[PDB]
Design a protein around this nucleic acid. Structure first.
Ligand SMILES: [Mg+2]
Ligand SMILES: [Mg+2]
Ligand SMILES: [Mg+2]
Ligand SMILES: [Mg+2]
Ligand SMILES: [Mg+2]
Ligand SMILES: [Mg+2]
Ligand SMILES: [Mg+2]
Ligand SMILES: [Mg+2]
Ligand SMILES: [Mg+2]
Ligand SMILES: [Mg+2]
Ligand SMILES: [Mg+2]
Ligand SMILES: [Mg+2]
Ligand SMILES: [Mg+2]
Ligand SMILES: [Mg+2]
Ligand SMILES: [Mg+2]
Ligand SMILES: [Mg+2]
Ligand SMILES: [Mg+2]
Ligand SMILES: [Mg+2]
Ligand SMILES: [Mg+2]
Ligand SMILES: [Mg+2]
Ligand SMILES: [Mg+2]
Ligand SMILES: [Mg+2]
Ligand SMILES: [Mg+2]
Ligand SMILES: [Mg+2]
Ligand SMILES: [Mg+2]
Ligand SMILES: [Mg+2]
Ligand SMILES: [Mg+2]
Ligand SMILES: [Mg+2]
Ligand SMILES: [Mg+2]
Ligand SMILES: [Mg+2]
Ligand SMILES: [Mg+2]
Ligand SMILES: [Mg+2]
Ligand SMILES: [Mg+2]
Ligand SMILES: [Mg+2]
Ligand SMILES: [Mg+2]
Ligand SMILES: [Mg+2]
Ligand SMILES: [Mg+2]
Ligand SMILES: [Mg+2]
Ligand SMILES: [Mg+2]
Ligand SMILES: [Mg+2]
Ligand SMILES: [Mg+2]
Ligand SMILES: [Mg+2]
Ligand SMILES: [Mg+2]
Ligand SMILES: [Mg+2]
Ligand SMILES: [Mg+2]
Ligand SMILES: [Mg+2]
Ligand SMILES: [Mg+2]
Ligand SMILES: [Mg+2]
Ligand SMILES: [Mg+2]
Ligand SMILES: [Mg+2]
Ligand SMILES: [Mg+2]
Ligand SMILES: [Mg+2]
Ligand SMILES: [Mg+2]
Ligand SMILES: [Mg+2]
Ligand SMILES: [Mg+2]
Ligand SMILES: [Mg+2]
Ligand SMILES: [Mg+2]
Ligand SMILES: [Mg+2]
Ligand SMILES: [Mg+2]
Ligand SMILES: [Mg+2]
Ligand SMILES: [Mg+2]
Ligand SMILES: [Mg+2]
Ligand SMILES: [Mg+2]
Ligand SMILES: [Mg+2]
Ligand SMILES: [Mg+2]
Ligand SMILES: [Mg+2]
Ligand SMILES: [Mg+2]
Ligand SMILES: [Mg+2]
Ligand SMILES: [Mg+2]
Ligand SMILES: [Mg+2]
Ligand SMILES: [Mg+2]
Ligand SMILES: [Mg+2]
Ligand SMILES: [Mg+2]
Ligand SMILES: [Mg+2]
Ligand SMILES: [Mg+2]
Ligand SMILES: [Mg+2]
Ligand SMILES: [Mg+2]
Ligand SMILES: [Mg+2]
Ligand SMILES: [Mg+2]
Ligand SMILES: [Mg+2]
Ligand SMILES: [Mg+2]
Ligand SMILES: [Mg+2]
Ligand SMILES: [Mg+2]
Ligand SMILES: [Mg+2]
Ligand SMILES: [Mg+2]
Ligand SMILES: [Mg+2]
Ligand SMILES: [Mg+2]
Ligand SMILES: [Mg+2]
Ligand SMILES: [Mg+2]
Ligand SMILES: [Mg+2]
Ligand SMILES: [Mg+2]
Ligand SMILES: [Mg+2]
Ligand SMILES: [Mg+2]
Ligand SMILES: [Mg+2]
Ligand SMILES: [Mg+2]
Ligand SMILES: [Mg+2]
Lengths: 136, 78, 386, 59
RNA sequence: GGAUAGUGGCCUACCAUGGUUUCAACGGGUAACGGGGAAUAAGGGUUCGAUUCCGGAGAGGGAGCCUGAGAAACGGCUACCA
RNA sequence: GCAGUCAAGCGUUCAUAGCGACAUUGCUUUUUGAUUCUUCGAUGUCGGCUCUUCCUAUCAUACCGAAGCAGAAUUCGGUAAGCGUUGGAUUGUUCACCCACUAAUAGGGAACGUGAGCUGGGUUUAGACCGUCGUGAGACAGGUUAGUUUUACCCUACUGAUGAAUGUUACCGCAAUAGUAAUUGAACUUAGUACGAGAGGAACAGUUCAUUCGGAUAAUUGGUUUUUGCGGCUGUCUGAUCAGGCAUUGCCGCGAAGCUACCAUCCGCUGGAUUAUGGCUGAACGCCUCUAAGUCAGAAUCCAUGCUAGAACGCGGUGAUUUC
RNA sequence: GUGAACAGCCUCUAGUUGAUAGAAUAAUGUAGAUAAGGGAAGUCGGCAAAAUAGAUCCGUAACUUCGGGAUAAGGAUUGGC
């Protein structure tokens, strides 16, 4: 959540704390994303900031095209294996933890994304709905 | 308000009850409880589990009046 | 030195002492303002928390992402069989506070409430109120005078009601008596209403409309002696800490040379009296109504009791209140519902809630079927049949 | 607008491979099989139109 | 024996221990499709041929396959990857 | 370390919007000194962890005044400590230095708070290596490595828990005093609007969500499993079968109930009086002035409302009050 | 008996059943365990704990004093009948 995201994300259960590495679902040349921060996060002594879905994280590329490594870049979470609950009462969880590289406005860097996506993320980032195949 | 069925057990999962799993290939699986979800997560074959619907269905279990002569005819001749 | 890192204080201070409460029946420390333009009626009610269940309904939030979409919410149901008015207490204003002037009582009193005045009911001779009821033998002129006193003085009026515990699956057999403020018209009109209801009964529909924001007052669950870790939420200590770790490391500074009231210490957790507010009423059910759990969209003839009954409580056979969410108190505890102390629009209040389906599947386990019919339908015939 | 197909399963939508002689599919070449989506055969609230035939008149 | 339209380790079961190599196997390279041919004129050669004709291979990369006399076709389908 | 006074100067012009020389007056006791009063028949040495309260010389958040404030931004100042002030990499570190989020990542006190609270990385015994010095033993506000952290049953404090005696016993209540809590952000809309040549570019009302904090609760989901509840498995033992024993709860899958998680759900009230500040009326002082008398408005403040406890030596109403 | 085995676990002979009891099962402990999603962000430091493990088969690097490194690494397999 943050800059350039139209709409409002209901509180979705967390589960991707800093240090977590998630699969890169786009075709930018990166295959993993090491989370290092969470845009729009809280501050509480010793509480590790976490991202849940559609949240904008600051990450680094640990395995991928050398031109994407050794640097920090924004990323948007599209899949999280931690089960959360929607207002419609469903306790759902994906099979992995995945995100895609994006710029601060929210525009992506990859042509498209491989794998399903959560509506909460699509409903939050417009350029994701375009490059996303199947939501939820 | 749809009442779904377990992807393993085949039992009715009312609103809220159970869990939902979105496989990597975007295939969906709905479970009524931790039990069916665990058996599935264990890679157990439902038609080998004596209590699931698709097991009973595949094993001729409890259907004698649903398959019998009926009186469903039509109106004809104009 | 200073704290070296800021963090908010653990626990709320306006909830001290964290001691056991004085009684299971939490006290209603406040009643709503009184507009005498309205008719006389109760301002609170008694019940017993029976349990919780799940409900599905359409959400009317003009601007929410779930607007007009179905939502699944948690709700509690409190068995609230009609209360019975047996007395009226008038209170007068004094420079040292409000004080009770007189307490007129009903002629006859049900044994339910009568045993409340006893601690060993069977051994006793059950002579309570025996001499009192007799001041009614003549025209009586006692009751009339004391009531007349309440009219001339006692600018605030309260009725003495008690629960019909006999009509509840509970086994306690001891009714619950309490004072309820009348928020109707003229003080004379108030006492008049109280007198006219002596030994009579009052239902919940006559005191609570549907969709109303009501507050709940009750004693929370008991947990006994609790370590400072879970009693206050303090951080667990590291593994290598000798002399235990579910504690607070620095109980306080060298100066002041005393442990401070504001420090977190080990003690009694639970059994605290709480006053939760703004619980929207979803359903106001009647016990003499089959299909209690039915809705205009569901329509199946089923009561609210889950299959197998409410775990640890039983069945609901009387009027009941279904409030959105959870309320303080545990299963089988005497609860007091009270009309909120203020008008609140909030766009969340005033929501004309309309249920769609109420869960009735068993709660004593991972239930699958709503009604025994549904169970037999999806399951077929068994060996215990035929 | 997805049409249903009698007898299959699932009052939801699925994707099958259809051939000659099969419902909801008009081949365009000889031996041409195509993968197309079809709605189930169990009525649901998602249906915009229901096809029905009378077998007995009323009153 | 099976499978093929058919021969054949094509494939399978059993069995054996063979098969190629300084007369260069095996591997590597190729800014490699092969050939008819083109360029350079003592001769012997040296260099080139993606490219009008013949043959082969492919249809973004693979694999799979329906129709058929004929396709493992792609201005056919199916799946995966891009 | 912090704050003034005078005002030559800086600031296009202009001393004081924001600054400020020369000088001069002060405050502070988380600097370092200076002293050597107390402790050498011992007051356990730095850091961090944890947790509480306090200070304001206020970083953020509330309301304001000023600008060299057009908008946006920012700066100066007032009332203000009600509230919050974080996640990491190297370092034993305090400090430092980056990375990163954030409304902000403000400074401090509490025996430089906090070792019968921990930890013991550093320092600072005994082993040992190297460098420098010494003939040598040995030495180094030089560099390395290894090196036992004791006791609470007392009193008090604090947290919770019983309790004699005011005729006996019981039910309903009052409310002194004490405690008290909520917090901050984003988006939609306003609105590409106000303002500007332009680039740029707000806010008040409304709505949807979120952060920090708190009190509950267990319908749902997840965790937990001596339900040793059901099934399964290895080894042995009861001749076999059945059914079982033993293997520090033998192992495994499922597993209710209970307990429980921002890993789950629900709830977190509204009146008044003020501050700064801006004003009304209005003298002193025939004019002028928010002030002198009187007076309006107004803040995350304050007092109430609400919430918690109920004085075991504060209290009210009401029931029943014994025969060997 | 299991198994490579004087291992561990169960048994025969022989020998014990000797350790103050009784009732509960608050906090905090000592000792034994499990934990969703993340996976060292904890910390002086992965302290602690977890993970690994037998056997058969395949596969095994730099470097080397040629003796090693090497169970290197990395894999598949295992009951019963
Ligand atoms: Mg967030
Ligand atoms: Mg920390
Ligand atoms: Mg590398
Ligand atoms: Mg595109
Ligand atoms: Mg479970
Ligand atoms: Mg501080
Ligand atoms: Mg009287
Ligand atoms: Mg515990
Ligand atoms: Mg230790
Ligand atoms: Mg001390
Ligand atoms: Mg042959
Ligand atoms: Mg050979
Ligand atoms: Mg050669
Ligand atoms: Mg080539
Ligand atoms: Mg060539
Ligand atoms: Mg030639
Ligand atoms: Mg030549
Ligand atoms: Mg050619
Ligand atoms: Mg070429
Ligand atoms: Mg071809
Ligand atoms: Mg091309
Ligand atoms: Mg093709
Ligand atoms: Mg073409
Ligand atoms: Mg062609
Ligand atoms: Mg001067
Ligand atoms: Mg000048
Ligand atoms: Mg000027
Ligand atoms: Mg200083
Ligand atoms: Mg000294
Ligand atoms: Mg001394
Ligand atoms: Mg000394
Ligand atoms: Mg001492
Ligand atoms: Mg000393
Ligand atoms: Mg001391
Ligand atoms: Mg100017
Ligand atoms: Mg200044
Ligand atoms: Mg000011
Ligand atoms: Mg404060
Ligand atoms: Mg104060
Ligand atoms: Mg920091
Ligand atoms: Mg750290
Ligand atoms: Mg560190
Ligand atoms: Mg540097
Ligand atoms: Mg000091
Ligand atoms: Mg100290
Ligand atoms: Mg110590
Ligand atoms: Mg040390
Ligand atoms: Mg030491
Ligand atoms: Mg060290
Ligand atoms: Mg030493
Ligand atoms: Mg010396
Ligand atoms: Mg030294
Ligand atoms: Mg050392
Ligand atoms: Mg050692
Ligand atoms: Mg002692
Ligand atoms: Mg005490
Ligand atoms: Mg006496
Ligand atoms: Mg806060
Ligand atoms: Mg706009
Ligand atoms: Mg301009
Ligand atoms: Mg909370
Ligand atoms: Mg809790
Ligand atoms: Mg339950
Ligand atoms: Mg469960
Ligand atoms: Mg068993
Ligand atoms: Mg066996
Ligand atoms: Mg048998
Ligand atoms: Mg034995
Ligand atoms: Mg043993
Ligand atoms: Mg165990
Ligand atoms: Mg459970
Ligand atoms: Mg109010
Ligand atoms: Mg007041
Ligand atoms: Mg004034
Ligand atoms: Mg004045
Ligand atoms: Mg004056
Ligand atoms: Mg406030
Ligand atoms: Mg309140
Ligand atoms: Mg008292
Ligand atoms: Mg009294
Ligand atoms: Mg023998
Ligand atoms: Mg002993
Ligand atoms: Mg013993
Ligand atoms: Mg004992
Ligand atoms: Mg324990
Ligand atoms: Mg387990
Ligand atoms: Mg875990
Ligand atoms: Mg991992
Ligand atoms: Mg680490
Ligand atoms: Mg790592
Ligand atoms: Mg170290
Ligand atoms: Mg370190
Ligand atoms: Mg270890
Ligand atoms: Mg494990
Ligand atoms: Mg090695
Ligand atoms: Mg086998």
């Amino acid at each position: 959540s943050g800059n350039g995201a139209q709409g409002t994300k209901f509180r979705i259960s967390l589960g991707l704390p800093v240090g977590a590495i998630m699969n890169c679902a786009d075709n930018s040349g990166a295959r993993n994303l090491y989370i290092i921060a969470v845009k729009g996060s809280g501050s509480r002594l010793n509480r590790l900031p976490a991202a849940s879905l559609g949240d904008m994280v600051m990450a680094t590329v640990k395995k991928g095209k050398p031109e994407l490594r050794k640097k920090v870049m924004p990323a948007i979470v599209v899949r999280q294996a931690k089960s959360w609950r929607r207002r419609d009462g469903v306790f759902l969880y994906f099979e992995d933890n995945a995100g895609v590289i994006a710029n601060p406005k929210g525009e992506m860097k990859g042509s498209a994304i491989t794998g399903p996506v959560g509506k909460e993320c699509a409903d939050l980032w417009p350029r994701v709905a375009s490059n996303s195949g199947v939501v939820v | 308000m749809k009442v779904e069925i377990d992807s393993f057990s085949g039992a009715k999962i009312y609103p809220g009850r159970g869990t939902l799993f979105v496989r990597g290939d975007s295939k969906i699986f709905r479970f009524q409880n931790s039990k069916s979800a665990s058996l599935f997560k264990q890679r157990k074959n439902p038609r080998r589990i004596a209590w699931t619907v698709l097991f009973r269905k595949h094993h001729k279990k409890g259907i004698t009046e649903e398959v019998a002569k009926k009186r469903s005819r039509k109106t004809v001749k104009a | 030195s200073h704290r070296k890192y800021e963090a908010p204080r653990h626990g709320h201070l306006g909830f001290l002492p964290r001691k056991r409460a004085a009684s299971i029946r939490a006290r209603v420390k406040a009643f709503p303002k009184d507009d005498r333009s309205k008719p006389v009626a109760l301002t609170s009610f008694l019940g017993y928390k029976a349990g919780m269940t799940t409900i599905v309904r359409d959400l009317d939030r003009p601007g929410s992402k779930f607007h007009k979409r179905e939502v699944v919410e948690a709700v509690t149901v409190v068995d609230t069989p009609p209360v019975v008015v047996v007395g009226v207490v008038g209170y007068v204003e004094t420079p040292r506070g409000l004080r009770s002037l007189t307490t007129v009582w009903a002629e006859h009193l049900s044994d339910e409430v009568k045993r409340r005045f006893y601690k060993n009911w069977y051994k006793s001779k059950k002579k309570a109120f025996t001499k009192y009821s007799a001041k009614y033998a003549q025209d009586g002129a006692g009751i009339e005078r004391e009531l007349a006193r309440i009219k001339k003085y006692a600018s605030v009026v309260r009725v003495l009601v008690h629960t019909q515990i006999r009509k509840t699956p509970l086994a306690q057999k001891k009714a619950h008596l309490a004072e309820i403020q009348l928020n109707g018209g003229s003080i004379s009109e108030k006492v008049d209403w109280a007198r006219e209801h002596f030994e009579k009964t009052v239902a919940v529909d006559s005191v609570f409309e549907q969709n109303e924001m009501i507050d709940a007052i009750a004693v929370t669950k008991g947990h006994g002696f609790e370590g400072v870790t879970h009693r206050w939420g303090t951080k667990k200590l590291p593994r290598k800490t000798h002399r235990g770790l579910r504690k607070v490391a620095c109980i306080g500074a060298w100066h002041p040379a005393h442990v401070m009231w504001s420090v977190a210490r080990a003690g009694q957790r639970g059994y605290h009296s709480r006053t939760s507010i703004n619980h929207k009423i979803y359903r106001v059910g009647k016990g003499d109504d089959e299909a209690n759990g039915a809705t205009s969209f569901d329509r199946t003839k089923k009561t609210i009791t889950p299959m197998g009954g409410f775990v640890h409580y039983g069945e609901i056979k009387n009027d009941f209140i279904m409030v959105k969410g959870c309320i303080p108190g545990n299963r089988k505890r005497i609860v007091t519902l009270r009309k909120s102390l203020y008008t609140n629009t909030s766009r969340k209040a005033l929501e004309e809630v309309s249920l769609k389906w109420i869960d009735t599947a068993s709660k004593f386990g991972k239930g699958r079927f709503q009604t025994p019919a549904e169970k037999h339908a999806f399951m077929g015939t068994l060996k215990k049949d035929l | 607008g997805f049409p249903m197909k009698q007898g299959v399963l699932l009052p939801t939508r699925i994707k099958l491979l259809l051939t000659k002689n099969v419902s909801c599919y008009r081949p365009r070449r000889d031996g041409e099989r195509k993968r197309k989506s079809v709605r189930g055969a169990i009525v649901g609230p998602d249906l915009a139109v229901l096809a029905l035939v009378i077998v007995k008149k009323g009153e």
